[PDB]
PDB file of all heavy atoms in Angstrom:
ATOM      1  N   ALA A  27      68.679  54.305  74.632  1.00  0.00           N
ATOM      2  CA  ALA A  27      69.900  53.449  74.892  1.00  0.00           C
ATOM      3  C   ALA A  27      69.895  52.349  75.924  1.00  0.00           C
ATOM      4  O   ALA A  27      70.659  51.451  75.869  1.00  0.00           O
ATOM      5  CB  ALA A  27      71.035  54.440  74.793  1.00  0.00           C
ATOM      6  N   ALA A  28      69.130  52.604  76.981  1.00  0.00           N
ATOM      7  CA  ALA A  28      68.684  51.508  77.962  1.00  0.00           C
ATOM      8  C   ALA A  28      67.235  51.509  78.057  1.00  0.00           C
ATOM      9  O   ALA A  28      66.595  52.350  78.634  1.00  0.00           O
ATOM     10  CB  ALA A  28      69.414  51.713  79.295  1.00  0.00           C
ATOM     11  N   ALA A  29      66.661  50.436  77.449  1.00  0.00           N
ATOM     12  CA  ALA A  29      65.204  50.193  77.574  1.00  0.00           C
ATOM     13  C   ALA A  29      64.878  48.938  78.405  1.00  0.00           C
ATOM     14  O   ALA A  29      64.051  48.062  78.053  1.00  0.00           O
ATOM     15  CB  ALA A  29      64.618  50.000  76.164  1.00  0.00           C
ATOM     16  N   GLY A  30      65.462  48.863  79.524  1.00  0.00           N
ATOM     17  CA  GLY A  30      65.403  47.771  80.531  1.00  0.00           C
ATOM     18  C   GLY A  30      66.779  47.060  80.780  1.00  0.00           C
ATOM     19  O   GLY A  30      67.238  47.271  81.898  1.00  0.00           O
ATOM     20  N   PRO A  31      67.281  46.273  79.943  1.00  0.00           N
ATOM     21  CA  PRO A  31      68.641  45.530  80.080  1.00  0.00           C
ATOM     22  C   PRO A  31      69.781  46.561  80.103  1.00  0.00           C
ATOM     23  O   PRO A  31      69.578  47.778  80.113  1.00  0.00           O
ATOM     24  CB  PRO A  31      68.732  44.666  78.872  1.00  0.00           C
ATOM     25  CG  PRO A  31      67.980  45.350  77.724  1.00  0.00           C
ATOM     26  CD  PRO A  31      66.798  46.034  78.480  1.00  0.00           C
ATOM     27  N   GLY A  32      70.965  45.993  80.106  1.00  0.00           N
ATOM     28  CA  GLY A  32      72.169  46.846  80.126  1.00  0.00           C
ATOM     29  C   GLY A  32      73.433  45.929  80.071  1.00  0.00           C
ATOM     30  O   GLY A  32      73.918  45.725  78.993  1.00  0.00           O
ATOM     31  N   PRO A  33      73.788  45.219  81.108  1.00  0.00           N
ATOM     32  CA  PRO A  33      75.009  44.361  81.149  1.00  0.00           C
ATOM     33  C   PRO A  33      74.921  43.155  80.283  1.00  0.00           C
ATOM     34  O   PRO A  33      75.738  42.885  79.514  1.00  0.00           O
ATOM     35  CB  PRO A  33      75.170  43.979  82.771  1.00  0.00           C
ATOM     36  CG  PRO A  33      73.780  43.991  83.241  1.00  0.00           C
ATOM     37  CD  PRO A  33      73.122  45.178  82.464  1.00  0.00           C
ATOM     38  N   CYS A  34      73.704  42.515  80.406  1.00  0.00           N
ATOM     39  CA  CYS A  34      73.465  41.203  79.641  1.00  0.00           C
ATOM     40  C   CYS A  34      73.461  41.606  78.175  1.00  0.00           C
ATOM     41  O   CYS A  34      74.264  40.975  77.368  1.00  0.00           O
ATOM     42  CB  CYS A  34      72.022  40.769  80.033  1.00  0.00           C
ATOM     43  SG  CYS A  34      71.666  39.175  79.104  1.00  0.00           S
ATOM     44  N   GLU A  35      72.755  42.581  77.648  1.00  0.00           N
ATOM     45  CA  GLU A  35      72.655  42.915  76.251  1.00  0.00           C
ATOM     46  C   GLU A  35      73.944  43.471  75.799  1.00  0.00           C
ATOM     47  O   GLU A  35      74.435  43.176  74.634  1.00  0.00           O
ATOM     48  CB  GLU A  35      71.561  44.085  76.180  1.00  0.00           C
ATOM     49  CG  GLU A  35      71.500  44.612  74.758  1.00  0.00           C
ATOM     50  CD  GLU A  35      70.445  45.647  74.545  1.00  0.00           C
ATOM     51  OE1 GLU A  35      70.051  46.316  75.569  1.00  0.00           O
ATOM     52  OE2 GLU A  35      69.958  45.815  73.375  1.00  0.00           O
ATOM     53  N   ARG A  36      74.810  44.082  76.657  1.00  0.00           N
ATOM     54  CA  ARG A  36      76.175  44.550  76.294  1.00  0.00           C
ATOM     55  C   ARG A  36      77.071  43.298  76.170  1.00  0.00           C
ATOM     56  O   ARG A  36      77.750  43.172  75.047  1.00  0.00           O
ATOM     57  CB  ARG A  36      76.684  45.421  77.493  1.00  0.00           C
ATOM     58  CG  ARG A  36      76.310  46.833  77.364  1.00  0.00           C
ATOM     59  CD  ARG A  36      77.218  47.610  76.491  1.00  0.00           C
ATOM     60  NE  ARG A  36      77.099  47.434  75.078  1.00  0.00           N
ATOM     61  CZ  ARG A  36      77.970  47.656  74.078  1.00  0.00           C
ATOM     62  NH1 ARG A  36      79.143  48.086  74.429  1.00  0.00           N
ATOM     63  NH2 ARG A  36      77.685  47.593  72.774  1.00  0.00           N
ATOM     64  N   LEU A  37      77.087  42.465  77.173  1.00  0.00           N
ATOM     65  CA  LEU A  37      77.996  41.259  77.047  1.00  0.00           C
ATOM     66  C   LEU A  37      77.630  40.362  75.876  1.00  0.00           C
ATOM     67  O   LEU A  37      78.618  40.010  75.028  1.00  0.00           O
ATOM     68  CB  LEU A  37      77.874  40.426  78.374  1.00  0.00           C
ATOM     69  CG  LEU A  37      78.403  38.997  78.345  1.00  0.00           C
ATOM     70  CD1 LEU A  37      79.948  39.010  77.935  1.00  0.00           C
ATOM     71  CD2 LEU A  37      78.238  38.337  79.692  1.00  0.00           C
ATOM     72  N   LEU A  38      76.414  40.033  75.788  1.00  0.00           N
ATOM     73  CA  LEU A  38      75.836  39.210  74.609  1.00  0.00           C
ATOM     74  C   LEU A  38      76.215  39.711  73.233  1.00  0.00           C
ATOM     75  O   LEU A  38      76.431  39.117  72.375  1.00  0.00           O
ATOM     76  CB  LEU A  38      74.406  38.936  74.766  1.00  0.00           C
ATOM     77  CG  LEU A  38      73.966  38.076  75.978  1.00  0.00           C
ATOM     78  CD1 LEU A  38      72.479  37.936  76.021  1.00  0.00           C
ATOM     79  CD2 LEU A  38      74.637  36.723  75.937  1.00  0.00           C
ATOM     80  N   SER A  39      76.285  41.114  73.262  1.00  0.00           N
ATOM     81  CA  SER A  39      76.685  41.834  72.051  1.00  0.00           C
ATOM     82  C   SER A  39      78.117  41.593  71.627  1.00  0.00           C
ATOM     83  O   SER A  39      78.413  41.274  70.457  1.00  0.00           O
ATOM     84  CB  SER A  39      76.580  43.402  72.121  1.00  0.00           C
ATOM     85  OG  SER A  39      75.217  43.751  71.796  1.00  0.00           O
ATOM     86  N   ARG A  40      79.030  41.570  72.652  1.00  0.00           N
ATOM     87  CA  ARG A  40      80.553  41.412  72.422  1.00  0.00           C
ATOM     88  C   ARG A  40      80.795  39.964  72.001  1.00  0.00           C
ATOM     89  O   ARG A  40      81.362  39.712  70.936  1.00  0.00           O
ATOM     90  CB  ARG A  40      81.348  41.780  73.629  1.00  0.00           C
ATOM     91  CG  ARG A  40      80.917  43.170  74.282  1.00  0.00           C
ATOM     92  CD  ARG A  40      80.828  44.294  73.297  1.00  0.00           C
ATOM     93  NE  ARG A  40      82.241  44.499  72.705  1.00  0.00           N
ATOM     94  CZ  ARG A  40      82.446  45.519  71.744  1.00  0.00           C
ATOM     95  NH1 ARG A  40      81.467  46.341  71.474  1.00  0.00           N
ATOM     96  NH2 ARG A  40      83.676  45.696  71.322  1.00  0.00           N
ATOM     97  N   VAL A  41      80.297  39.018  72.857  1.00  0.00           N
ATOM     98  CA  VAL A  41      80.442  37.587  72.490  1.00  0.00           C
ATOM     99  C   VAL A  41      80.004  37.249  71.032  1.00  0.00           C
ATOM    100  O   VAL A  41      80.686  36.376  70.444  1.00  0.00           O
ATOM    101  CB  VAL A  41      79.615  36.822  73.511  1.00  0.00           C
ATOM    102  CG1 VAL A  41      79.765  35.289  73.308  1.00  0.00           C
ATOM    103  CG2 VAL A  41      79.951  37.149  74.928  1.00  0.00           C
ATOM    104  N   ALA A  42      79.112  38.004  70.514  1.00  0.00           N
ATOM    105  CA  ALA A  42      78.503  37.760  69.177  1.00  0.00           C
ATOM    106  C   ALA A  42      79.636  38.136  68.050  1.00  0.00           C
ATOM    107  O   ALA A  42      80.055  37.355  67.343  1.00  0.00           O
ATOM    108  CB  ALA A  42      77.301  38.614  68.948  1.00  0.00           C
ATOM    109  N   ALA A  43      80.156  39.396  68.265  1.00  0.00           N
ATOM    110  CA  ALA A  43      81.180  39.898  67.378  1.00  0.00           C
ATOM    111  C   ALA A  43      82.498  39.252  67.555  1.00  0.00           C
ATOM    112  O   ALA A  43      83.334  39.134  66.712  1.00  0.00           O
ATOM    113  CB  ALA A  43      81.365  41.460  67.666  1.00  0.00           C
ATOM    114  N   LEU A  44      82.700  38.659  68.807  1.00  0.00           N
ATOM    115  CA  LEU A  44      83.910  38.002  69.244  1.00  0.00           C
ATOM    116  C   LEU A  44      84.021  36.605  68.792  1.00  0.00           C
ATOM    117  O   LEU A  44      84.975  36.004  68.405  1.00  0.00           O
ATOM    118  CB  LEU A  44      84.123  38.052  70.767  1.00  0.00           C
ATOM    119  CG  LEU A  44      84.325  39.521  71.268  1.00  0.00           C
ATOM    120  CD1 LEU A  44      84.370  39.488  72.780  1.00  0.00           C
ATOM    121  CD2 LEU A  44      85.646  40.077  70.734  1.00  0.00           C
ATOM    122  N   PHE A  45      82.736  35.878  68.829  1.00  0.00           N
ATOM    123  CA  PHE A  45      82.489  34.477  68.431  1.00  0.00           C
ATOM    124  C   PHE A  45      81.604  34.549  67.137  1.00  0.00           C
ATOM    125  O   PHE A  45      80.478  33.937  67.237  1.00  0.00           O
ATOM    126  CB  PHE A  45      82.029  33.753  69.583  1.00  0.00           C
ATOM    127  CG  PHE A  45      83.026  33.674  70.668  1.00  0.00           C
ATOM    128  CD1 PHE A  45      82.832  34.453  71.841  1.00  0.00           C
ATOM    129  CD2 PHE A  45      84.091  32.692  70.643  1.00  0.00           C
ATOM    130  CE1 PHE A  45      83.663  34.316  72.912  1.00  0.00           C
ATOM    131  CE2 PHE A  45      84.897  32.557  71.732  1.00  0.00           C
ATOM    132  CZ  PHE A  45      84.671  33.356  72.839  1.00  0.00           C
ATOM    133  N   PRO A  46      82.098  34.944  66.052  1.00  0.00           N
ATOM    134  CA  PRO A  46      81.384  34.903  64.720  1.00  0.00           C
ATOM    135  C   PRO A  46      81.148  33.469  64.231  1.00  0.00           C
ATOM    136  O   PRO A  46      80.339  33.221  63.331  1.00  0.00           O
ATOM    137  CB  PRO A  46      82.190  35.768  63.717  1.00  0.00           C
ATOM    138  CG  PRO A  46      83.709  35.402  64.232  1.00  0.00           C
ATOM    139  CD  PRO A  46      83.462  35.472  65.775  1.00  0.00           C
ATOM    140  N   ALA A  47      81.822  32.564  64.773  1.00  0.00           N
ATOM    141  CA  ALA A  47      81.806  31.074  64.508  1.00  0.00           C
ATOM    142  C   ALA A  47      80.308  30.554  64.494  1.00  0.00           C
ATOM    143  O   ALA A  47      79.941  29.651  63.784  1.00  0.00           O
ATOM    144  CB  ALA A  47      82.658  30.265  65.486  1.00  0.00           C
ATOM    145  N   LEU A  48      79.530  31.183  65.374  1.00  0.00           N
ATOM    146  CA  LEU A  48      78.176  30.903  65.544  1.00  0.00           C
ATOM    147  C   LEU A  48      77.162  32.139  65.146  1.00  0.00           C
ATOM    148  O   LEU A  48      77.741  33.134  64.837  1.00  0.00           O
ATOM    149  CB  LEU A  48      77.902  30.325  66.906  1.00  0.00           C
ATOM    150  CG  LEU A  48      78.262  31.280  68.041  1.00  0.00           C
ATOM    151  CD1 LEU A  48      77.139  32.025  68.642  1.00  0.00           C
ATOM    152  CD2 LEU A  48      79.078  30.519  69.120  1.00  0.00           C
ATOM    153  N   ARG A  49      75.915  31.832  65.437  1.00  0.00           N
ATOM    154  CA  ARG A  49      74.896  32.911  65.176  1.00  0.00           C
ATOM    155  C   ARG A  49      75.138  34.190  66.016  1.00  0.00           C
ATOM    156  O   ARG A  49      75.742  34.096  67.166  1.00  0.00           O
ATOM    157  CB  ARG A  49      73.507  32.268  65.517  1.00  0.00           C
ATOM    158  CG  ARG A  49      73.085  31.305  64.381  1.00  0.00           C
ATOM    159  CD  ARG A  49      71.873  30.515  64.933  1.00  0.00           C
ATOM    160  NE  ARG A  49      70.676  31.201  65.069  1.00  0.00           N
ATOM    161  CZ  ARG A  49      69.570  30.831  65.746  1.00  0.00           C
ATOM    162  NH1 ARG A  49      69.646  29.635  66.295  1.00  0.00           N
ATOM    163  NH2 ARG A  49      68.471  31.420  65.730  1.00  0.00           N
ATOM    164  N   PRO A  50      74.679  35.304  65.535  1.00  0.00           N
ATOM    165  CA  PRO A  50      74.959  36.584  66.257  1.00  0.00           C
ATOM    166  C   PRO A  50      74.217  36.719  67.601  1.00  0.00           C
ATOM    167  O   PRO A  50      74.721  36.999  68.552  1.00  0.00           O
ATOM    168  CB  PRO A  50      74.412  37.600  65.256  1.00  0.00           C
ATOM    169  CG  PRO A  50      73.320  36.921  64.450  1.00  0.00           C
ATOM    170  CD  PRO A  50      73.875  35.492  64.359  1.00  0.00           C
ATOM    171  N   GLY A  51      72.930  36.255  67.575  1.00  0.00           N
ATOM    172  CA  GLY A  51      72.034  36.343  68.802  1.00  0.00           C
ATOM    173  C   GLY A  51      71.373  34.938  68.982  1.00  0.00           C
ATOM    174  O   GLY A  51      70.388  34.946  69.730  1.00  0.00           O
ATOM    175  N   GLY A  52      71.950  33.893  68.462  1.00  0.00           N
ATOM    176  CA  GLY A  52      71.306  32.581  68.644  1.00  0.00           C
ATOM    177  C   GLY A  52      72.239  31.689  69.466  1.00  0.00           C
ATOM    178  O   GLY A  52      72.714  30.593  69.063  1.00  0.00           O
ATOM    179  N   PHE A  53      72.553  32.217  70.621  1.00  0.00           N
ATOM    180  CA  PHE A  53      73.386  31.556  71.695  1.00  0.00           C
ATOM    181  C   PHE A  53      72.951  31.957  73.054  1.00  0.00           C
ATOM    182  O   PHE A  53      72.452  32.921  73.314  1.00  0.00           O
ATOM    183  CB  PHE A  53      74.886  31.771  71.449  1.00  0.00           C
ATOM    184  CG  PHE A  53      75.275  33.207  71.856  1.00  0.00           C
ATOM    185  CD1 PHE A  53      75.875  33.342  73.060  1.00  0.00           C
ATOM    186  CD2 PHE A  53      75.027  34.314  71.097  1.00  0.00           C
ATOM    187  CE1 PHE A  53      76.230  34.585  73.503  1.00  0.00           C
ATOM    188  CE2 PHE A  53      75.405  35.577  71.627  1.00  0.00           C
ATOM    189  CZ  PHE A  53      76.004  35.732  72.828  1.00  0.00           C
ATOM    190  N   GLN A  54      73.274  30.987  73.954  1.00  0.00           N
ATOM    191  CA  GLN A  54      73.063  31.220  75.456  1.00  0.00           C
ATOM    192  C   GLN A  54      74.347  31.072  76.199  1.00  0.00           C
ATOM    193  O   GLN A  54      75.133  30.084  76.104  1.00  0.00           O
ATOM    194  CB  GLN A  54      71.952  30.272  75.900  1.00  0.00           C
ATOM    195  CG  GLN A  54      70.547  30.982  75.922  1.00  0.00           C
ATOM    196  CD  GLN A  54      70.602  32.155  76.917  1.00  0.00           C
ATOM    197  OE1 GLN A  54      69.865  33.166  76.616  1.00  0.00           O
ATOM    198  NE2 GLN A  54      71.229  32.103  77.998  1.00  0.00           N
ATOM    199  N   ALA A  55      74.636  32.080  77.067  1.00  0.00           N
ATOM    200  CA  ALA A  55      75.710  32.058  77.928  1.00  0.00           C
ATOM    201  C   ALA A  55      75.429  31.570  79.294  1.00  0.00           C
ATOM    202  O   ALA A  55      74.413  31.898  79.930  1.00  0.00           O
ATOM    203  CB  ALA A  55      76.291  33.522  78.038  1.00  0.00           C
ATOM    204  N   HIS A  56      76.141  30.501  79.721  1.00  0.00           N
ATOM    205  CA  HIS A  56      75.801  29.719  80.954  1.00  0.00           C
ATOM    206  C   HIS A  56      77.057  29.971  81.932  1.00  0.00           C
ATOM    207  O   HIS A  56      78.118  29.908  81.532  1.00  0.00           O
ATOM    208  CB  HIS A  56      75.916  28.291  80.654  1.00  0.00           C
ATOM    209  CG  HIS A  56      74.894  27.815  79.498  1.00  0.00           C
ATOM    210  ND1 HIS A  56      75.106  27.980  78.296  1.00  0.00           N
ATOM    211  CD2 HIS A  56      73.671  27.170  79.661  1.00  0.00           C
ATOM    212  CE1 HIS A  56      74.024  27.496  77.572  1.00  0.00           C
ATOM    213  NE2 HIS A  56      73.167  27.023  78.432  1.00  0.00           N
ATOM    214  N   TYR A  57      76.655  30.281  83.175  1.00  0.00           N
ATOM    215  CA  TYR A  57      77.612  30.634  84.173  1.00  0.00           C
ATOM    216  C   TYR A  57      77.481  29.588  85.338  1.00  0.00           C
ATOM    217  O   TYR A  57      76.297  29.123  85.601  1.00  0.00           O
ATOM    218  CB  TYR A  57      77.429  32.148  84.721  1.00  0.00           C
ATOM    219  CG  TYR A  57      76.191  32.177  85.703  1.00  0.00           C
ATOM    220  CD1 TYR A  57      76.344  32.179  87.014  1.00  0.00           C
ATOM    221  CD2 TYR A  57      74.850  32.256  85.205  1.00  0.00           C
ATOM    222  CE1 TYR A  57      75.298  32.279  87.919  1.00  0.00           C
ATOM    223  CE2 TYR A  57      73.806  32.271  86.011  1.00  0.00           C
ATOM    224  CZ  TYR A  57      73.905  32.295  87.414  1.00  0.00           C
ATOM    225  OH  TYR A  57      72.931  32.420  88.269  1.00  0.00           O
ATOM    226  N   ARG A  58      78.618  29.318  85.904  1.00  0.00           N
ATOM    227  CA  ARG A  58      78.684  28.328  87.148  1.00  0.00           C
ATOM    228  C   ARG A  58      78.098  29.104  88.297  1.00  0.00           C
ATOM    229  O   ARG A  58      78.299  30.261  88.567  1.00  0.00           O
ATOM    230  CB  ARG A  58      80.074  27.902  87.397  1.00  0.00           C
ATOM    231  CG  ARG A  58      80.988  29.081  87.697  1.00  0.00           C
ATOM    232  CD  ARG A  58      82.123  28.673  88.686  1.00  0.00           C
ATOM    233  NE  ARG A  58      82.705  29.876  89.260  1.00  0.00           N
ATOM    234  CZ  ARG A  58      82.138  30.758  90.136  1.00  0.00           C
ATOM    235  NH1 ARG A  58      80.877  30.494  90.521  1.00  0.00           N
ATOM    236  NH2 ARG A  58      82.736  31.811  90.656  1.00  0.00           N
ATOM    237  N   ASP A  59      77.496  28.266  89.057  1.00  0.00           N
ATOM    238  CA  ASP A  59      76.849  28.747  90.358  1.00  0.00           C
ATOM    239  C   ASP A  59      77.737  28.252  91.546  1.00  0.00           C
ATOM    240  O   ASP A  59      78.698  27.603  91.299  1.00  0.00           O
ATOM    241  CB  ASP A  59      75.448  28.284  90.509  1.00  0.00           C
ATOM    242  CG  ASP A  59      74.521  29.029  89.531  1.00  0.00           C
ATOM    243  OD1 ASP A  59      74.957  29.717  88.616  1.00  0.00           O
ATOM    244  OD2 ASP A  59      73.214  28.882  89.766  1.00  0.00           O
ATOM    245  N   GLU A  60      77.161  28.414  92.818  1.00  0.00           N
ATOM    246  CA  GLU A  60      77.816  27.983  94.040  1.00  0.00           C
ATOM    247  C   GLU A  60      77.980  26.455  94.022  1.00  0.00           C
ATOM    248  O   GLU A  60      79.009  26.002  94.569  1.00  0.00           O
ATOM    249  CB  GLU A  60      76.952  28.413  95.268  1.00  0.00           C
ATOM    250  CG  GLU A  60      75.554  27.975  94.985  1.00  0.00           C
ATOM    251  CD  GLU A  60      74.600  28.489  96.180  1.00  0.00           C
ATOM    252  OE1 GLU A  60      74.353  29.783  96.030  1.00  0.00           O
ATOM    253  OE2 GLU A  60      74.300  27.773  97.049  1.00  0.00           O
ATOM    254  N   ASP A  61      77.167  25.716  93.311  1.00  0.00           N
ATOM    255  CA  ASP A  61      77.222  24.289  93.121  1.00  0.00           C
ATOM    256  C   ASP A  61      78.210  23.885  92.000  1.00  0.00           C
ATOM    257  O   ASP A  61      78.664  22.865  92.018  1.00  0.00           O
ATOM    258  CB  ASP A  61      75.849  23.673  92.914  1.00  0.00           C
ATOM    259  CG  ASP A  61      74.918  23.947  94.119  1.00  0.00           C
ATOM    260  OD1 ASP A  61      75.346  23.464  95.209  1.00  0.00           O
ATOM    261  OD2 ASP A  61      73.910  24.625  93.990  1.00  0.00           O
ATOM    262  N   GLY A  62      78.263  24.816  90.972  1.00  0.00           N
ATOM    263  CA  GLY A  62      79.170  24.548  89.883  1.00  0.00           C
ATOM    264  C   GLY A  62      78.459  24.289  88.484  1.00  0.00           C
ATOM    265  O   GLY A  62      78.926  24.594  87.441  1.00  0.00           O
ATOM    266  N   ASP A  63      77.118  23.881  88.698  1.00  0.00           N
ATOM    267  CA  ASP A  63      76.176  23.614  87.471  1.00  0.00           C
ATOM    268  C   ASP A  63      76.153  24.917  86.715  1.00  0.00           C
ATOM    269  O   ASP A  63      76.311  26.008  87.025  1.00  0.00           O
ATOM    270  CB  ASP A  63      74.894  23.198  88.097  1.00  0.00           C
ATOM    271  CG  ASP A  63      74.856  21.916  88.709  1.00  0.00           C
ATOM    272  OD1 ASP A  63      75.866  21.608  89.463  1.00  0.00           O
ATOM    273  OD2 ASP A  63      73.743  21.233  88.684  1.00  0.00           O
ATOM    274  N   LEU A  64      75.717  24.664  85.395  1.00  0.00           N
ATOM    275  CA  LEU A  64      75.556  25.700  84.384  1.00  0.00           C
ATOM    276  C   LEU A  64      74.152  26.251  84.393  1.00  0.00           C
ATOM    277  O   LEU A  64      73.219  25.498  84.466  1.00  0.00           O
ATOM    278  CB  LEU A  64      75.877  25.216  82.980  1.00  0.00           C
ATOM    279  CG  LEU A  64      77.443  25.203  82.678  1.00  0.00           C
ATOM    280  CD1 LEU A  64      77.595  24.595  81.246  1.00  0.00           C
ATOM    281  CD2 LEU A  64      78.081  26.529  82.867  1.00  0.00           C
ATOM    282  N   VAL A  65      74.099  27.582  84.382  1.00  0.00           N
ATOM    283  CA  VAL A  65      72.858  28.324  84.410  1.00  0.00           C
ATOM    284  C   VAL A  65      72.810  29.376  83.284  1.00  0.00           C
ATOM    285  O   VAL A  65      73.564  30.382  83.387  1.00  0.00           O
ATOM    286  CB  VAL A  65      72.641  28.963  85.857  1.00  0.00           C
ATOM    287  CG1 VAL A  65      71.243  29.689  85.900  1.00  0.00           C
ATOM    288  CG2 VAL A  65      72.696  27.909  86.913  1.00  0.00           C
ATOM    289  N   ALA A  66      72.142  29.093  82.206  1.00  0.00           N
ATOM    290  CA  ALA A  66      71.936  29.926  81.080  1.00  0.00           C
ATOM    291  C   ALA A  66      71.360  31.198  81.464  1.00  0.00           C
ATOM    292  O   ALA A  66      70.112  31.320  81.707  1.00  0.00           O
ATOM    293  CB  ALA A  66      71.132  29.262  79.967  1.00  0.00           C
ATOM    294  N   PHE A  67      72.111  32.266  81.623  1.00  0.00           N
ATOM    295  CA  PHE A  67      71.616  33.577  82.049  1.00  0.00           C
ATOM    296  C   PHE A  67      71.406  34.340  80.799  1.00  0.00           C
ATOM    297  O   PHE A  67      71.960  34.182  79.700  1.00  0.00           O
ATOM    298  CB  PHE A  67      72.769  34.335  82.895  1.00  0.00           C
ATOM    299  CG  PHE A  67      73.937  34.805  82.063  1.00  0.00           C
ATOM    300  CD1 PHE A  67      73.841  36.089  81.532  1.00  0.00           C
ATOM    301  CD2 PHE A  67      74.984  34.048  81.950  1.00  0.00           C
ATOM    302  CE1 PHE A  67      74.913  36.575  80.774  1.00  0.00           C
ATOM    303  CE2 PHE A  67      76.120  34.464  81.268  1.00  0.00           C
ATOM    304  CZ  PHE A  67      75.979  35.835  80.689  1.00  0.00           C
ATOM    305  N   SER A  68      70.447  35.334  80.922  1.00  0.00           N
ATOM    306  CA  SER A  68      69.919  36.225  79.886  1.00  0.00           C
ATOM    307  C   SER A  68      69.162  37.417  80.405  1.00  0.00           C
ATOM    308  O   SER A  68      68.374  37.989  79.685  1.00  0.00           O
ATOM    309  CB  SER A  68      69.127  35.317  78.879  1.00  0.00           C
ATOM    310  OG  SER A  68      68.108  34.733  79.563  1.00  0.00           O
ATOM    311  N   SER A  69      69.550  37.857  81.598  1.00  0.00           N
ATOM    312  CA  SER A  69      68.959  39.007  82.224  1.00  0.00           C
ATOM    313  C   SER A  69      69.981  39.796  83.139  1.00  0.00           C
ATOM    314  O   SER A  69      70.770  39.056  83.751  1.00  0.00           O
ATOM    315  CB  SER A  69      67.830  38.539  83.193  1.00  0.00           C
ATOM    316  OG  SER A  69      66.885  37.811  82.349  1.00  0.00           O
ATOM    317  N   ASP A  70      69.852  41.074  83.119  1.00  0.00           N
ATOM    318  CA  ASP A  70      70.785  41.980  83.911  1.00  0.00           C
ATOM    319  C   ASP A  70      70.783  41.568  85.443  1.00  0.00           C
ATOM    320  O   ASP A  70      71.859  41.454  86.029  1.00  0.00           O
ATOM    321  CB  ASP A  70      70.342  43.402  83.750  1.00  0.00           C
ATOM    322  CG  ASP A  70      68.985  43.679  84.300  1.00  0.00           C
ATOM    323  OD1 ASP A  70      68.015  43.409  83.564  1.00  0.00           O
ATOM    324  OD2 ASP A  70      68.856  43.989  85.574  1.00  0.00           O
ATOM    325  N   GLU A  71      69.657  41.222  85.949  1.00  0.00           N
ATOM    326  CA  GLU A  71      69.482  40.825  87.314  1.00  0.00           C
ATOM    327  C   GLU A  71      70.293  39.462  87.585  1.00  0.00           C
ATOM    328  O   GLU A  71      70.680  39.270  88.788  1.00  0.00           O
ATOM    329  CB  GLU A  71      67.951  40.527  87.523  1.00  0.00           C
ATOM    330  CG  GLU A  71      67.307  39.316  86.884  1.00  0.00           C
ATOM    331  CD  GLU A  71      67.700  37.976  87.559  1.00  0.00           C
ATOM    332  OE1 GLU A  71      67.716  37.975  88.790  1.00  0.00           O
ATOM    333  OE2 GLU A  71      68.027  37.071  86.716  1.00  0.00           O
ATOM    334  N   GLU A  72      70.524  38.755  86.592  1.00  0.00           N
ATOM    335  CA  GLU A  72      71.345  37.455  86.730  1.00  0.00           C
ATOM    336  C   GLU A  72      72.791  37.819  86.644  1.00  0.00           C
ATOM    337  O   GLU A  72      73.621  37.111  87.251  1.00  0.00           O
ATOM    338  CB  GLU A  72      70.877  36.531  85.562  1.00  0.00           C
ATOM    339  CG  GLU A  72      71.077  35.104  85.968  1.00  0.00           C
ATOM    340  CD  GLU A  72      70.248  34.124  85.169  1.00  0.00           C
ATOM    341  OE1 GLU A  72      69.237  34.581  84.570  1.00  0.00           O
ATOM    342  OE2 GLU A  72      70.792  32.913  84.914  1.00  0.00           O
TER     343      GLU A  72
END
């Protein structure tokens, strides 16, 4: 049930079912940093 990831794979799962408007796993989630710029995250460490 955890083969490395955890939070990322969990979040990306919900966003897929929540946003059926697009692909299930064909999207990137970008988060603002200290600067404000977008950083496409895709790892638990992130």
Side-chain angles (χ1 to χ4, degrees):
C34 185
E35 179 180 21
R36 275 273 77 201
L37 166 58
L38 295 180
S39 273
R40 312 310 297 181
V41 181
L44 297 173
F45 298 100
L48 58 99
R49 286 165 70 196
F53 76 99
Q54 264 298 142
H56 307 77
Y57 76 98
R58 63 151 196 64
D59 286 16
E60 55 188 76
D61 296 305
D63 294 35
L64 282 176
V65 183
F67 75 88
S68 54
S69 301
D70 63 280
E71 70 76 42
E72 207 160 334

